[PDB]
Amino acid sequence: TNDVHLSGMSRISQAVLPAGTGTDGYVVVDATIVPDLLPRLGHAARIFQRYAVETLEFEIQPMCPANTGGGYVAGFLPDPTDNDHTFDALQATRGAVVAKWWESRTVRPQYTRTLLWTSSGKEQRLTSPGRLILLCVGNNTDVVNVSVLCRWSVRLSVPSLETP
Amino acid sequence: TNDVHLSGMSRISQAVLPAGTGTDGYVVVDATIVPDLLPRLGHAARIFQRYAVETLEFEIQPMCPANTGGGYVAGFLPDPTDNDHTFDALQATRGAVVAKWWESRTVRPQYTRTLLWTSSGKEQRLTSPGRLILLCVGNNTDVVNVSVLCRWSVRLSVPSLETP
Amino acid sequence: TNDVHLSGMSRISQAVLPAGTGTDGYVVVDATIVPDLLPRLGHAARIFQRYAVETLEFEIQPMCPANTGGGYVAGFLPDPTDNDHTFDALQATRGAVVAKWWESRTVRPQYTRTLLWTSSGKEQRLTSPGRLILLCVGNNTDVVNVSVLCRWSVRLSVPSLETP
Amino acid sequence: TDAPVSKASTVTGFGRGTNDVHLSGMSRISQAVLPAGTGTDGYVVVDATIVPDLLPRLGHAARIFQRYAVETLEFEIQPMCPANTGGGYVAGFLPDPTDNDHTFDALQATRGAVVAKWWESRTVRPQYTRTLLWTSSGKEQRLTSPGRLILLCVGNNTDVVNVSVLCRWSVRLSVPSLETP
Amino acid sequence: TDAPVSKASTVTGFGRGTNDVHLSGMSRISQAVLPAGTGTDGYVVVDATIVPDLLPRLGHAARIFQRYAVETLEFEIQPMCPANTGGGYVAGFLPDPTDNDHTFDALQATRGAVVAKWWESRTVRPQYTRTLLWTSSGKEQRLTSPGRLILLCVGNNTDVVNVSVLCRWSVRLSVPSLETP
Amino acid sequence: TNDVHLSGMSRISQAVLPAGTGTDGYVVVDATIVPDLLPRLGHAARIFQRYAVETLEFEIQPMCPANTGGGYVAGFLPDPTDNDHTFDALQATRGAVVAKWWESRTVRPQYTRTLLWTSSGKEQRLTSPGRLILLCVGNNTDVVNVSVLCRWSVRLSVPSLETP
Ligand SMILES: [Ca+2]
Ligand SMILES: [Ca+2]
Ligand SMILES: [Ca+2]
Ligand SMILES: [Ca+2]
Ligand SMILES: [Ca+2]
Ligand SMILES: [Ca+2]
């Protein structure tokens, strides 16, 4: 059948937060989940027209010394159009996490499994499952290298050969 | 088995043989069948390590006036390492065809079904099912534009992110 | 029967990363998994001709203070010939991990269970399941002593007595 | 039937040659002569990589096929010397064409290895892959050869030794083609 | 078992190779190109004595056998030229390898001879002996070849003519040996 | 039970007895049967701690002219500690053979099937099933070259990495 099931785990974001610039509410990461953001899924969506996100998980992997103060709040807004970047908006989303800067965590988001479009278009809601937003909570004492990883699983349909 | 089955038709070769240059035995098309040669299988092998050829057929679709002279012989050598490019080598193999330049033909070859490698290596026998050769039979009279297409079906395995 | 099942856990790599030299993308570990790299499996493959890797896991055990910044990305390329040493290439592999320098992790790779050859030869793909690559992510503040361990399980066949 | 601009080609049976041929035979893969005293322990009397070229009729048959599978493979060490000859031989078929280990222990480790005196003949019934091998040569010879037969001296030979190493082979050839060296 | 002066030889399967092999195939026995005007009446386009050497796989197979019998023999005249070409050809298989008569009447006298236009393909179903022939060459070639296939022009060709002469052959090989040229 | 069963034939001893030196009772071969004596079992015991002898047979294969004089007596003492090397000790044991120098014989001995230790220790009775002795009977006339081979089958246990 045209449907092929792919899974993988890749880094959606890499950010560096210097010491003291991580004020409360600062936006460390704001990544709109698109197939191009994921390498293997990037090629897979380059050879397909439609994709549906069966499973989606995120892993916040901040690489900082244990003596680092402050923390982060990480969430997955299931609306690509939504631009709210406050603590309450993230915490309202299912699976959002709050953790110290030296404590890696996992986000298990909730979203609607609809058949999306691999290629971009006018309406972003038909192409992306949502956005991942990672904000600072409090103040960080050291420099934090944050890697945001995404464990994904998709179903691909309508074969084609697209261009970026 | 997280094996992805992918299939489709794609042009492996495009050749423009000018009138008068198509002497007998001239190698119009010489293509070692690797996934990088195929457009969609190119990306599929870019995101996978291993592939197995389940279905392989070649379609010689030359576009020239019906009053043109000469012909072609097309054949699939199941050995990628073999470098013999003559009418005898093509006639020995199975699935080979010989037809006039205005005719469209199908080569149904004898190919290995083992698990080959998408990337290149020291031994070509572990990476390609074989090569396809299209030669002139006689001398052409008009300008011939021959496109060699391939209906292929593969099974892909061992996810990765390869480079050209 | 000739088939004997062996398992074990041994250190494939020992590396020392001084303070500040662990720049992002630096290659800490690049080990081609061969039976000689594993002591007990080294002797076992010295008394056999063929081996098949039934189970393969890796444990990254970096020994550094909790106040160490930066991290690592560890992966198992299931292609011994592949020489890509970038973050995306590792992350595309199944089971790849990203972690802080003071956080031990485990890699559960995916690979094709084919009957390999214990002794070396021209084509490396017939002798090795792949390579383990461990790269730096960000900058390390302290000195990191990294031990890369491999928990393996093999099936051995075709008895012989080989020499190194 | 009207006259067309061009008629369709009428070549029908093209690319339909025979695919499988079973070929059996027996041939001398080696012949060695040893003057007295030369056959010290460990001396390599015979070292022959079993390939279609080594067997003449199989070589000619493999020149017109792409792949071959060894259905049957057996060897005979037939030394034609009297019973007053001292010393002996060890013979074994290494299933790895690449391995070049030439010792008593390496041969004895293999299945079917024989240790005999120079006035005794033996049959080596070895362990060989049944998988399809390539008739033509390539970069890796593990895809083209089932292995190599090795024959060493165990002790010093008192007299001259004439040893002939024979092979009964049965093969199935497949994927017809026309190979050239 | 007492120790004798010498033991009997234990070579058993020697001289027991395969005797009969049926080999079939199809090959181009000739290829000719004719520029405009050269193909006058009676011009000998093709003159090929059908021997195992003419057929490559059959040549290699006959190098390891002594005798062969032609079970099936058919020829195809396949001229790859347009329908606007003038002239024609006569094709026939003379069952006598020695006869070198190259005329229209000599070819037409034989059974299965075909007369066609240059834009028409024909199949020659000839008359050939089923008796055992010798794979290797000798003084008299009537014992080694079933005959010769001959192809002449009937009229002047207006355009260039490319003609390929093919052969479907089936043979049974017997009396195994190892021939050398 | 992660017990590895390994078997094969290997030469335990190679002796060159020159003509005239083979007086009656001369100890041609004296070998305490330990896994280090066997070539392939050498590596097998190098990667294991304990072994149990399931099958043990010795093959005396002397290579000499049929007109040579004298003979040999071969026997397996089931006690490694025993130091009696005489015809009487060999004739007392079971499985012993006596034959002319041109004859090839098989000693099927009486050996313990308990779990012995691959390494050496204070007590030899916990490490070896016994010893094999090959003695001269009479005086030889020609130079004798005797190889003592052993068909052995063992069960190995308790993985380790031993030293010579
Ligand atoms: Ca699209
Ligand atoms: Ca690769
Ligand atoms: Ca080997
Ligand atoms: Ca070939
Ligand atoms: Ca002859
Ligand atoms: Ca020990």
In sequence order, what DSSP letters do the residues of E126-151 get, joined into one string? -----S-EESS--S-GGGT-SEEEEE
Residue in F11, F143, F145 closest to D108 by CB: F11
Rounded to the nearest angstrom, the minimum Cα separation between F62 and chain E is 15
* All residues at 6 or more sequence positions from D173 whose CB lies less than 8 Å from its CB, including other chains: D20, D21, D22, D23, D61, D62, D65, D67, D68, D135
Partner chains of B (3+ C-beta pairs under 8 Å): A, C, D, E
- CA dihedral in degrees (D1, D5, D10, D11; nearest 10)? 180
In terms of Cα–Cα distance, which of D82, D91, D96 is closest to D161?
D82
Alpha-carbon span C115 to D152, nearest angstrom: 30
- CA–CA gap between residue A29 and residue A15 (Å, rounded): 7
Cα separation, B19 vs B144, in Å, equals 7
The answer to whether A76 and A95 are in contact (CB under 8 A) is yes
Helix/strand/coil for C33 = coil
Residue F109 in tokens: 């001995």
Looking up tokens 């008569």, which residue turns up? E101
C127 vs A: CB within 8 A: no
Residue A31 CB partners (closer than 8 Å, separation 6+): A12, A13, A37, A131, A132, A148
Are C49 and D96 within 8 A, CB to CB? Answer: yes
Distance from CA of E24 to the nearest CA of B (A): 12
Q: Are F117 and F126 in contact (CB under 8 A)?
A: yes
Cross-chain Cβ contact E10/D121 below 8 Å? yes
- Positions of E strands within C18-160: 27-32, 48-63, 71-77, 97-100, 105-107, 116-117, 131-137, 144-159
Put simply, the answer to whether B66 touches D19 (Cβ < 8 Å) is no
Residue type, B54: E
CA distance readout (Å), D110 to C79, D40, D141: 30, 22, 20
The technique by which this structure was obtained is: cryo-EM
Neighbours of A96 (CB within 10 A): 20
Tell me if chain E has a CB within 8 Å of the CB of F99.
Answer: no
Gyration radius from chain D CA atoms: 22
Q: Is the dihedral of CA F89, F94, F95, F100 positive or negative?
A: positive
| Spatial separation of the C-alpha atoms in residues E102 and E171, rounded to whole Å | 27
Establish whether B49 is an annotated binding residue.
yes
| Contact yes or no for F29/F149 (Cβ under 8 A) | no
| C160: nearest CA partner in chain F | F40
Neighbours of E64 (CB within 10 A): 23
- Is E44 in the B-facing interface, judged by CB distances under 8 Å? no
**Amino acid identity, position A73:** V
Dig out the tokens for E171 from the structure.
């043979």
C103 is in an annotated binding site: no
Distance (Å, whole) CA E134 – CA E176 = 12
* Torsion sign, CA atoms F33, F37, F39, F42: positive
Burial (CB < 10 A; 0-12, 13-18, 19+), residue C1, is exposed
CA–centroid distance, residue D135 to ligand 5 (Å) = 26
Q: Which two tokens stand for residue D91?
A: 């013979």
**Is there contact between B and D if contact means ≥3 C-beta pairs under 8 Å?**
yes
Do residues C138 and C73 lie in contact, with contact meaning Cβ atoms separated by under 8 Å?
Answer: no
Distance CA D66, CA D56 (A): 16
Query: Which residues of C fall within a CB distance of 8 Å from B49?
Result: 78-79
**Who contacts E66 (Cβ-Cβ below 8 Å, separation ≥6)?**
E134, E135, E136, E174, E175, E176, E177, E179
Q: Which residue of B has its CA nearest to C121?
A: B122
Q: Give, for A42, the enclosing helix (H) or strand (E).
A: helix A39-46
Whether chains D and F touch (3+ CB pairs under 8 A) is answered by: yes
Q: How many CB pairs under 8 A join A and B?
A: 33
Query: Measured between CB atoms, does C117 come within 8 Å of chain D?
Result: yes
Q: Find the closest chain B residue to C111 by CA distance.
A: B158
If we measure between CA atoms, which residue out of B57, B60, B149 comes closest to residue B101?
A: B60
* Cα dist from B53 to B50, B57, B109, B115, F16, whole Å: 10, 11, 12, 8, 60
Rounded Cα distance, F45 and A4, in Å: 49
Nearest-Cα distance to chain C for D111, in Å, is: 7
Query: Rounded CA gap, B4 and E48, in Å?
Result: 54
Residue E107 near residue E99, CB atoms below 8 Å: no
Any residues with CB less than 8 A from the CB of D23 and at least 6 apart, and which? D57, D58, D61, D170, D171, D172, D173, E18, E21
Which listed ligand is nearest to C158 at the C-alpha? 3
E78 vs D10: CB contact, 8 Å cut-off?
yes
> Left, alpha or beta for D98 (phi > 0: left; psi -120 to 50: alpha)?
alpha
Strand order in the sheet with E44-50: E44-50, E147-153, E88-94, E114-117
The 10 Å CB-count burial string (b at 16+, else e) for A17-50 is beeeebeeebebbebbbbbebbbbbbbbbbbbbb
Q: Does C139 reach chain A within 8 Å, measured CB to CB? A: yes
Is F66 at the interface with chain E, CB within 8 A? Answer: yes
Chain-chain contact of B159 with A8 (C-beta, under 8 angstroms)? yes
Is the CB of residue F22 less than 8 Å from the CB of residue F28?
Answer: yes
Sheet holding A131-137, edge to edge: A27-32, A131-137, A71-77, A97-100
Contacts of B112 (CB under 8 A, 6+ apart): B53, B78, B129, B130
Alpha-carbon distance of B132 to B13, in angstroms, equals 10
Report which of E152, E164, E148 is spatially closest to residue E31, judged by C-alpha positions. Answer: E164
Closest Cα partner for B17 from B156, B163, B148, B154?
B148
Whether residue C76 contacts residue C95, with contact meaning beta carbons closer than 8 Å, is answered with: yes
Gap between the Cα atoms of F132 and F128, Å rounded: 11
* Chain D residues closer than 8 Å to F149 by CB: 108, 115
- Residue C23 CA to residue C134 CA, distance in Å, equals 13
Collapsed DSSP state (helix, strand, coil) of residue F103 = coil
Token reading at F151: 């068909």
8 Å CB contact between E156 and E55: no
Instruction: Report the distance separating Cα A113 and Cα A111, nearest Å.
Output: 6
Q: Are D110 and D128 within 8 A, CB to CB?
A: no
User: What sign has the CA pseudo-torsion B126, B128, B130, B136?
Assistant: negative
Residues 6 or more apart whose Cβ sits within 8 Å of residue F69? F101, F138, F139, F140, F141, F142
Residue D120 is which amino acid?
E
Asked if F8 lies within 8 A of D109 by C-beta distance, the reply is: yes
Spell out which residues of chain F touch residue D81, defining contact as CB-CB under 8 Å: none
Any binding-site annotation on C49? yes
In whole angstroms, what is the distance from residue C73 CA to residue F96 CA?
Answer: 64
Contacts of E80 in chain D (CB under 8 A): 9
Q: Which chains touch D (3 or more CB pairs under 8 A)?
A: B, C, E, F
Q: Exposed e or buried b for every residue in B95-127, given b needs 16+ CB within 10 A?
A: bbbbbbbbbebebbbbbbeebbbbbebebbbbb
Name the helix (H) or strand (E) containing C9: strand C4-17
Q: Is D53 assigned a ligand-binding role in the annotation? A: no
Chain E touching partners, 3 or more CB pairs below 8 A: B, D, F
Pairing mode, strands F144-159 and F4-17: antiparallel
Contact D111, C1 (CB under 8 A): no
Query: Is C123 annotated as ligand-binding?
Result: no
Q: Please list, in sequence order, all residues whose beta carbon lies within 8 angstroms of the beta carbon of residue E139, skipping any fewer than 6 positions away.
A: none
The secondary structure of residue D85, as a DSSP letter, is: -
Phi and psi at C107, nearest 5°, equal -110, 125
Which residues have CB under 8 Å from E138's CB, separation 6+?
A: E144
In chain A, which residues have their Cβ closer than 8 Å to the Cβ of B2? 5, 7
Q: Which residues pair with A159 in a beta bridge?
A: A48
CB proximity list for E12: less than 8 A, separation 6 or greater? none
CB contact under 8 A, B79 and D6: no
Contact status, residue B110 vs residue B2, Cβ threshold 8 Å:
no
Cα D3 to ligand 1 centroid, rounded to whole Å: 48
Q: Report d(CA E104, CA C116) in Å as an integer.
A: 67
Cβ-contact E82, D6 below 8 angstroms: yes
CA–centroid distance, C125 to ligand 2, in Å, is 10
CB contact (8 A) between residue D105 and residue C162: no
Cα D77 to its chain centre, rounded Å, is 14
Residues of F with Cβ-Cβ distance to E3 under 8 angstroms: 66-67, 102
Write down the residue that tokens 């490559």 correspond to. Answer: E56
Check if D94 contacts C (Cβ < 8 Å).
Answer: yes
Which of A63, A146, A152 is the best residue to mutate to test the C interface, defined by the most C CB atoms within 10 Å of its own CB? A63
CB contacts, 8 Å: B75 with chain E: none
| F20: number of Cβ within 10 Å | 11
F98: CB partners within 8 A, 6+ apart: F71, F72, F73, F74, F137
The 3-state DSSP composition of chain F as helix, strand, coil percent (nearest 5) reads 10, 45, 45
Strand bridging mode D65-79 / D122-124: antiparallel
User: Does chain F touch chain B (at least 3 C-beta pairs within 8 Å)?
Assistant: no
- Residue A145 has φ and ψ, to the nearest 5°, of -100, 110
| Minimum distance, in Å, between the CA of residue C74 and any CA atom of chain B | 14
Annotated binding site of F for Ca(2+): 49, 79, 82, 119, 162
CA nearest to B92, candidates E135, D65, E163, A155: D65
- Please tell me the distance in Å from D180's CA to the nearest CA on chain B: 7
| Dist. CA F155–CA F115, nearest whole Å | 9
Q: Where are the beta strands (DSSP E) in E1-141?
A: 21-34, 44-50, 65-79, 88-94, 114-117, 122-124, 133-134
DSSP, res E59:
H
Nearest to F40 by CA among F126, F158, F115, F149: F149
One-letter amino acid for residue F35 of the chain = P
What is the distance between the alpha carbons of residues A29 and D158, in angstroms, rounded to a whole number? 86
Instruction: Identify the CA nearest to C56 among candidates C114, C136, C122, C4.
Output: C114
